[PDB]
């Protein structure tokens, strides 16, 4: 596109009980991107959030693995996790703390993966995983807040959601 | 009339030398009135002249870059809302941007501090009010204070 977005996409939208579907959170063409906070909701009776790297079930302090950006320790990346898996809420954030250094070097990290989250299927009921607004993030864009290397809030980007995990609609092929 | 008094403080570590500035400057206002004061260097506040018939009232507690807090008080006379050994706590990290706070502690606040990360008192770009623990440097200790109450709203007090 060249168009700016944050996107959550699954490797598959169908599965059997006990399969782990991988949700990958990406950013695309976010100018001078330096950090984010996101709020992602799911139905915890249908899916269980699991760490695809460690194999552990998500807890409140689990930061999702898998990023390909915001990895340069020269700029002091800081992870924050504040999930509530029992209520089907993932809420986490990461940024370079030393944004002035990042800006000075001038090598932008505008596209890549920021999180991978496993979702273990508990039952075959059609369900959605999505970015959603939260009272703890006033003025966010569907529960997403992206930051540039000036430390300012970025606006104007699309929020791409994954297709419905239509697990309750799995008929035999005709 | 009614007088209300108490102590306000913070829940983070700071250098003993900075106590005076840490504990002072918390604004306390009686909602619906012009009665207000600011805390002194021990975190003490006192507001006199509250109407005696005003048997229920709200104290609005605030400070630049702190998450505001409302405390409801029931009674008349000489009322004590907290003590020096168990003060009312206000959480640092609802940071002003262009003179405006949004009444939430979250990543927007972390990133405001990050604008002046690694600065020290004396530097052109050091901002005293963003040095949350008032130790003369803006760094990961200040960011960690914000993160301690990440996603907090005034209802979580
Ligand atoms: Ca705030
Ligand atoms: Ca400091």
Residue numbers in the entry:
A (entry chain A): 16 to 189
B (entry chain B): 8 to 164
Passage from the reporting paper:
Thus, in order to probe the mechanism by which CipB XDoc binds to ScaF and ScaA XDoc recognises ScaC2, the crystal structures of ScaF XDoc in complex with ScaC2 Coh (CtCohScaC2-XDocScaA) and CipB XDoc bound to ScaF (CtCohScaF-XDocCipB) were solved. Strikingly, the data revealed that the two Docs bound ScaF and ScaC2 in different orientations. The binding site for ScaF is located primarily in helix 3 of ScaA XDoc and helix 1 of CipB XDoc and is more polar. Binding to ScaF Coh involves the establishment of very important polar contacts between the side chains of Asn158/Asn122 with the Coh. To summarize, the structural and biochemical data here show that the ScaA and CipB XDoc modules bind to ScaC2 and ScaF Cohs in opposite orientations, and different helices thus dominate recognition of the different Cohs.
It is now well established that a wide array of highly ordered protein-protein interactions involving dockerin and cohesin modules (defined herein as Doc and Coh, respectively) mediate both cellulosome assembly and cellulosome cell-surface attachment. In addition to ScaA, inspection of C. thermocellum genome revealed the presence of an ORF (Cthe_1806) encoding a protein comprising 2177 amino acids and containing a putative type-II Doc, which was termed CipB.
